[PDB]
Amino acid sequence: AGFDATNILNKLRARHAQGGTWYGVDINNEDIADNFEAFVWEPAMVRINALTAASEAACLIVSVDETIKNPR
Amino acid sequence: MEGPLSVFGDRSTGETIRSQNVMAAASIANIVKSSLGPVGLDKMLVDDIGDVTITNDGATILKLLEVEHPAAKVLCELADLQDKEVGDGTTSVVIIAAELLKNADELVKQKIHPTSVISGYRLACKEAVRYINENLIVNTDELGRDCLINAAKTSMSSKIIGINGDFFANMVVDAVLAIKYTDIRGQPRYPVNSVNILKAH
Amino acid sequence: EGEETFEAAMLGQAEEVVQERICDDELILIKNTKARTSASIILRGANDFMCDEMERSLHDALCVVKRVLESKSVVPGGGAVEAALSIYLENYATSMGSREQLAIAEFARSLLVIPNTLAVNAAQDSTDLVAKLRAFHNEAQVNPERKNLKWIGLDLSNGKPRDNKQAGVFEPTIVKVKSLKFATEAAITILRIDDLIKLH
Amino acid sequence: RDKPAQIRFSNISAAKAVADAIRTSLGPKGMDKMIQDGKGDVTITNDGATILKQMQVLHPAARMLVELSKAQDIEAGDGTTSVVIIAGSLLDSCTKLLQKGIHPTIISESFQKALEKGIEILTDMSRPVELSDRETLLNSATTSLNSKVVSQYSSLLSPMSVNAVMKVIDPATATSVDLRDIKIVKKLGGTIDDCELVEGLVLTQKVSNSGITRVEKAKIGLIQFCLSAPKTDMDNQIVVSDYAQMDRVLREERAYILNLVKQIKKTGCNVLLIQKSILRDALSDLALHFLNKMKIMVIKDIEREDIEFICKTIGTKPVAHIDQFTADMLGSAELAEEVNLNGSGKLLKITGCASPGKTVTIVVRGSNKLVIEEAERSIHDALCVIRCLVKKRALIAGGGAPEIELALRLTEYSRTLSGMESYCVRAFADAMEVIPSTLAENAGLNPISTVTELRNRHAQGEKTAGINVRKGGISNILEELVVQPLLVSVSALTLATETVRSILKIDDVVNTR
Amino acid sequence: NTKRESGRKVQSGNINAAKTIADIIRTCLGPKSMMKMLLDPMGGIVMTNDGNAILREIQVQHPAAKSMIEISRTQDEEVGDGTTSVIILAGEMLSVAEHFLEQQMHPTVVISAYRKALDDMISTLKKIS
Amino acid sequence: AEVARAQAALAVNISAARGLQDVLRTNLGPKGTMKMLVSGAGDIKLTKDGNVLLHEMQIQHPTAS
C-alpha cells in the first residue's frame, strides 16, 4: 500500500485507541480508515477460522522440541 | 567489529557502529545487572593482577573500569553522573540506556522534523516524573502512623537485625533532631550522619 | 604555653554538667546545652560489633527520612514505579500512534529491565515481579493515589514487592526523576555527532 | 587509458565515499565517534562540520574535499557541510554519464551549465531581503543564532553583528563587512552579555601588567626601534673574567633604558607594538618594566596579527629610533585602554583610531573560554549570515530542501536544454535531491519511509512548495524560520561545480618527484 | 579496563583452585599426613603440609586461590593456626554446593545456608564442647 | 594451575628413584664396577662409590634432590 509499517500500524493502533471501529489500512485506496466503511469486506468466520488455526499449529508444534524419526 | 571493515577511526558508518555501540552499550550494563539492588552480587574485580577490588556498586565498578567505546563512554558518565547526583540510581540509570539507543535512533533517523523524536523518551520522563511526583502509595516517611518513629521502625524494619526499631525507631527520630545545623530552603531536616551516636557493649 | 590564664569565654553554660559513667565508659554529658539543642543516642548492645550491627540498620532509617525531609513527594524504590508507568506510558504511547506510539512505548518497554533483573538478582522469578505489580497496575488502578488500591512498591534487599509502604530502603522522588532523564540522555547522548570521518 | 578511466573512478571512489557518511548532516543524528587515525590515535569526534575541517582525508580526490568544506565557511560562514553534501551529489551523476560513456569534458561544462542556471533558479527561489536593514540583518542572523550554541545571547549577539555590519557596511547597498574587517577579539572574563561590540580597532593583545595607562591620548604603532644600553644595543669592550665587570654594564644598562622609555612616553606613547625582532634584547624585560613605569602599553614580540590590524585599520608606519626620538608614525590612537572585566583579561582597546569606516572589533567575553567561544562562534554566524545578506541580498531556506526545489526545475531546464548535456546536467539535476534524506540517514532502524518521500513531498509540493527539512512538514522552505541568504547555498554549487569537475580532468596519475 | 566475566564459568573456576588446593593438605592435615611437594622449574622440591607455603612459591590463581591465602592468613592471623583447615573446609562447601544448587537454581539460600550451617556448628559444638 | 596429584604424580618419583638407582647396581662390591662420571671439566671420575657419583653429575629429577 506504500506505507510505513512502523508509522501506520500505530496510527491504526492510535485510530483504534482514538477510533477503534474498523480503522485500518487500505491497500486499495492506499490510505488507512474503517475498512468496513472502506468497504473492505470479508466474513468473520474465515477470521474466526483464522484464529482457530492461528494458535492451533502455533501451540501445537511448540509442544514438540522432542521429535522422533525412523527413516529406518 | 561488524560489517564493513573498510574504514578505521570507529567509523563503521551506521547500524554497524550503532550496533557495535549497542553491543558495547549492552556490554557495560551487564555488571550492573548482576550488581543491581542490594541483592546485586558483590564483584571481586582485579585492579592489575593481584590488585583487586570487591565491589557491588556498578558506578564504583565503572570508576575502576575504562571506556573502550563512546557507547562504553557515554554511560560511564551518566551512570557516574547519577552516582554524582546521589549514589541512589547508579545501577538504575545504567541498564535502560543499552535498550533505548537501539530504540532511539530507529525513530530519529526517519527525520520528518527530526528534532523531537527522542523527546518521546523525554515527555515520557515528564509523564513519569509527574507520576513519580505522585507516589506516596509506597515509601512514606513523609508521615507514618507514628510518623518518623514507625517510618524509622519500618525503616528499622527495612534494615532489621532484631527487634531493633523499638528504641531504634525513636533514636532515628532522636537522631534527625539531635543534629541542628543551618539547612537551606528552610529545612528542619538536619544531616543524619553527623548525629552524635555512641556504641555500648 | 600553659602559662596562659583562663577566662570564662571558653566556659560552656549548662543547667549542670554532671559526670555519668555508664557501661564502664564515663562521658561528659552536658545537661541543658544552652546555645543550641543537642542530643546523642548511645547504643546498648552485646558488643560494639552488635552496636555496629544496629547502627548501620539505623542509618538507612535516617537518609530515607532525610531524603523524605528533602522531598515530601517520593516513590517506592525500584523499577516497580516503571511497572505502573511502563504499561501506562505504553498506553500513553498508544493513542499517540505513528512515531509517538513507538517512542513512548519503545521507551516504556525498555523500563522493565531494571526491577526484573533486580528480581532475579534476588532470584525472585522476574515473571513474579511483573505478575504482581502490573496486575495491580490497571485502568482499574492507573492510580498511585496516596495509598494502596494497587501495590506499586518493590523492596530492593528483597527483590520482591513486599507490603512495606514506609520502608527505609526505598528512595524519594529525588533520585528517580533524575534517573529517568539520564536514561533518556544516553539515548541522545551518543547521537549528537554530525556526519562521520576518519583521520590519518 | 584504464588508469585515467579508473583513477577518475578511483577519485570518484574515495571522495564520494567520504561525502556520504559525511552526511548525517546536522540533526541530532548518528552515534558519536572516537577516531583511531590512519597512523593511529583515539580521537573523540563530533559535529561533522568541524570534523570536515578536522578531516585529514588523504587521497587525490580526498584533499579537494577538506578544501571544499573550508571554502564554504570563508565563502559564507555557513553551509560548511552543505558544499560537500552536494559534492557526492555531483560525484554520482558523473558515473552514469561515464557509464553512459559521455565524455568527461563534455560532462565538465555541464557542471557550468548546472551552475549557470542553478544559481538563477536559486536566485528565483531567493527571497531578496535588504542587506542594510536592521530587521533582515537581525532576522537572518537570528535564524543562524537561534540555531547556534547560544540562542539566548543571540538576542544580544545579533544587533552586535547588525551594528558591526552597519558601521562597517558601505551605506545603503553594499557587498561589504568582510570577516577581515570584523576583528573578533576574545577577552578572558567578562560575560557573553559583556561581549562588547566596538566600532574601531581593539587589538586582542594582552597589555603589560595593569595599573598602566587607561587614559586618553595614546600613541600606538609598531615600532621597530630598540632600546639601547650597555650589553643591550650598545658597544662594550669588557669581557667578564670577574664579577665586577659583569655588574658594571648592568648598572649603566637599566638606567640608560630607563631614560629611553621616557623618550617613548615623551613621544606621547601610551602604547607601543614592539618589533618581534631583537638584537640581544630590543626592548628588554626591564625596558618594558621601564616603559610601563611611564605607562606605555607594551607586549614583547607582539603577535603578528595585531601588528596587521593596526597597520590595516590605522595605517601604521615604521618609527624612528628612540635616540632619534620618533617619526610619530605610530598610528593615530586617542585611547590606550586596558579593560579588566570579571577581573580577568588584559585587552588593548584603540578607539578613536584611524578607521576606514570598517573594522568593527567585537570584544568577546565570558566567564570561561568555552563561555567566550559559544557566542563567539554564534555571533560569527550572526556576522556571516548578515555578511551573507550584505554580500548577497536574499533569504532562501537552510537545510538543503531548496536544492530539491532547484532539482525539479533544473531537470526540466536540461530537458529543455535538449543536449547531450541535457542528459549530463539532468542526471545531476535530480541527483541533487539526495541531501535531506542523507541528513536524516545515519541514525536508526526501519529506515525507508521518509527517505524517498522527502524528494517526493517537495516534488508533490512542486516548484513553489516542499517539505521543511528541519521543521518537517510541507511548507515552502525559503521562508520558514529555516532560512539562509542565498550566498550561502550558491557558493556550495560553485565550489563543488569545479573541484568535482577538476576530477573529470584528471587523466592517469603523476607524483612530482 | 572494562572486563566482564559470568556465571558458572568463574564460579567453576572458583570451585577448581581451592578444591584442588583442598586435596593434598586435607590428607596432610591431622595425624594422617602427606606432603605437598612443589616442583620448581629447576626441579627444586618443596614439600610441606602447608599449601599456602606452596601456593605462594608458584602462581596463585585469581578466582579461588587469591582469597584463600587471605582466609588462610585470617585464620592463622586470629588464633595463630588453621591455614590448612579453612581452605579444605571452604573447599568442601565450595565443591558440591553451588553447581548442584545452581542446577537447583538459586544463589540465595546457598549464601543463606552458610549462616545456618555455620551456627549449627556453634550450636552442636558448645553443647558437646 | 598445573598440578600433579596423588597416585599418578608419585609414579614419576618412584619411576625416577627406582630408575635412577638401578644404574648403581653396576657398583657396590668388586663384582660391581667403578662407575665413570664426567663433568664439564671432562674429568673421568671412576668410583664405585655412590656419593661421589651422586652429587656431581646426574639427570634432573625431583628425587635427584
Other beta carbons within 10 Å of D376:
22
Confirm if B16 and B30 have CB atoms less than 8 A apart.
Answer: no
Place of cell 620618533: D326
Could you give the residue numbers annotated as active site of D? 47, 80-81, 381
- On the CB side of D273, CA atoms within 13 Å amount to 30
Q: Within 13 A of C18's CA, how many CA atoms are on the CB side?
A: 6
CA C21/CA A63 separation, integer angstroms:
75
Q: Residue D377 and residue D195: Cα distance in Å, rounded?
A: 12
Indicate the helix (H) or strand (E) that contains A34.
strand A31-34
Tell me the technique behind this structure. cryo-EM
Question: Residues near B20 by Cβ (< 8 Å), separated by ≥ 6?
Answer: B1, B2, B12, B69, B71
List phi, psi (to 5°) of D433. Answer: -65, -5
Contacts with C57 from chain B: Cβ below 8 Å: 156, 159-161, 164-165, 168
Question: Which residues, 6+ apart, have CB-to-CB distance to B169 below 8 Å?
Answer: B146, B148, B149, B150, B151, B152, B153, B156, C61
* Torsion sign, CA atoms D9, D10, D16, D21: positive
- Nearest CA-CA partner of D147 in D423, D302, D378, D479: D378
Q: CA C115, C120, C124, C127 torsion: positive or negative?
A: positive
Contact D185, D347 (CB under 8 A): yes
Residue B201: partners with Cβ closer than 8 Å, 6 or more residues away:
C23, C45, C46, C47, C48, C50, C51
* Whether the Cβ atoms of residue D48 and residue C193 lie closer than 8 Å to each other: yes
A6 CB near a chain B CB, below 8 Å? yes
F partners (3+ CB pairs within 8 A) are E
Q: What are phi and psi of C74, to 5 degrees?
A: -145, -175
Between β-strands D183-188 and C171-172, what pairing exists: parallel, antiparallel or unpaired?
unpaired
Residue tagged 495491580 (cell numbers): C136
Reported in sequence order, the residue ranges of C56-126 that DSSP labels E, i.e. its strands, are: 74-75
Alpha-carbon separation of residue D424 from C182, D201, D358, D402, D405 (angstroms)? 51, 51, 45, 21, 19
Is residue D301 within 8 angstroms of chain C, CB to CB? no
CB contact under 8 A, F3 and E20: yes
Q: How would you class D93 by CB atoms within 10 Å of its CB: exposed for 0-12, middle for 13-18, buried for 19 or more?
A: buried
The set of cell numbers assigned to D200 is 574601531
Distance of alpha carbon D218 from alpha carbon D473, whole angstroms: 59
Q: By CB neighbour count within 10 A (0-12 exposed, 13-18 middle, 19+ buried), where does F40 fall?
A: exposed
- On whether the CB atoms of residues D337 and D348 are closer than 8 A, the answer is yes
Backbone angles phi, psi at C169, to 5 degrees: -90, 0
**Nearest residue in B to D446, CA atom:** B106
Name which of F43, F37, F28, F34 is nearest F58 in CA terms: F37
Distance CA D311, CA D443 (A): 50
Asked whether D395 and D213 are in contact (CB, 8 A), the reply is: no
Phi, psi of D437 (to 5 degrees): -70, -35
**φ and ψ at E51, to 5 degrees?**
-65, -35
| Chain E contact for C29 (CB, 8 A cutoff) | no
φ, ψ at F34 (rounded to 5°): -60, 130
Whose grid coordinates read 535498550?
B99
Q: Which residues of D touch C191 (CB under 8 A)?
A: 28-32, 443
> Please, are residues D131 and D173 in contact by the beta-carbon 8 Å criterion?
yes
* Interface C:F, ≥3 CB–CB pairs < 8 Å: no
d(CA D434, CA D440): 11
Q: Which of E35, E36, E37 to mutate to test the interface with F (most CBs of F within 10 A)?
A: E37
Kindly state the helix (H) or strand (E) to which residue B110 belongs, with its residue range: none
Q: Which chains touch E (3 or more CB pairs under 8 A)?
A: B, C, F
Question: Hey, is A6 helix, strand or coil?
Answer: helix
Q: Give the three-class secondary structure for A63.
A: coil
- Distance, in Å, from the CA atom of C123 to the CA atom of F44, rounded to the nearest integer, reads 75
Angle between helices C80-94 and B123-133 (to 10 degrees): 130
Burial call D296-329: b when 16+ CB within 10 Å, e when fewer: bbbbbebeeebbebbbbbbebeebebbeeebeee
Any residues with CB less than 8 A from the CB of D142 and at least 6 apart, and which?
D154, D158, D382
| 54-83 in chain D: CB under 8 A from chain C | 54-58, 81
E-assigned strand segments in D343-428: 344-349, 360-366
Q: What residues form DSSP beta bridges with D474?
A: D467
E-assigned strand segments in chain F: 35-37, 45-47
Interface test with D, best of B111, B117, B118, B119 (most D CBs within 10 A): B111
Burial of B181 (0-12, 13-18, 19+ CB in 10 A): exposed
Helix (H) or strand (E) holding D255: helix D243-266
The yes-or-no reply on B/D contact (3 CB pairs or more, < 8 Å) is yes
Query: Mapping DSSP to helix (H, G, I), strand (E, B) and coil, where does residue E125 land?
Result: helix
Residues just before a chain gap in chain F (C–N exceeding 2.5 Å) are none
Strands D271-274 and D297-299 turn out to be parallel
Interface of C with D (CB under 8 A): 188-200
Instruction: Check D30 against B14: CB less than 8 A apart.
Output: yes
**Is there a binding annotation on residue E2?**
no
DSSP symbol at F34 = P
CA distance E21 to D484: 76
Residue type for position D376:
E
